[PDB]
Amino acid sequence: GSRERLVYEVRQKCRNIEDICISCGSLNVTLEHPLFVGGMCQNCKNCFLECAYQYDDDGYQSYCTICCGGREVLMCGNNNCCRCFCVECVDLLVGPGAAQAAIDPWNCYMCGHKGTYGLLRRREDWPSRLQMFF
């Protein structure tokens, strides 16, 4: 329950989101997350690299953009994107109830006009950051 407790501490202004891995909750941050404000640990970086741009038979990405896992997911309707975000990450980082409110069509957090969704904030330079990340 480390990720949940740490996100709660972020909300209570007792912790900077840059100091936690937003994917798994590890405090062993080794880089800035390339897509969102917040940290990332080296294990999650490796997972992100290995899971990036793998696709299920429905044509959408296999693995949640944030935690690299997921079962029930929100799926981006932008065909140039095709990303998925699991309901657990959305309820944690956007906030309680956000996932079931996000369920037409749906542009994901990387594609929408707004970049701030609760504690989830899209990085300005994310396309170029991905180039450096990969």
What residues make contact with Zn ion under the rule CB under 5 A?
21, 23-24, 26, 41, 44, 64, 66-67, 70, 76, 78, 81, 83, 86, 89, 108, 110-111
Are 73 and 82 contacting, i.e. CB atoms less than 8 angstroms apart? no
Q: How far is the CB of 132 from Zn ion (least distance, A)?
A: 19
Q: How far is the CB of 72 from Zn ion (least distance, A)?
A: 10
Q: How far is the CB of 7 from Zn ion (least distance, A)?
A: 13
* Alpha helix segments (H runs only) across 1-134: 2-11, 42-51, 87-93, 98-102, 126-133
* Residues in the chain whose C lies over 2.5 Å from the next residue's N (breaks after): 103
Q: How far is the CB of 111 from Zn ion (least distance, A)?
A: 3
Q: Can you tell me the distance from the alpha carbon of 19 to that of 56, in angstroms, rounded to the nearest whole number?
A: 32
Judged by beta carbon, residue 26 or residue 120, the one nearer Zn ion is 26
Judged by beta carbon, residue 7 or residue 44, the one nearer Zn ion is 44
DSSP state of 9: H
| Tokens 């140039």, residue located | 80
Judged by beta carbon, residue 35 or residue 89, the one nearer Zn ion is 89
Judged by beta carbon, residue 65 or residue 132, the one nearer Zn ion is 65
Phi, psi of 91 (to 5 degrees): -65, -30
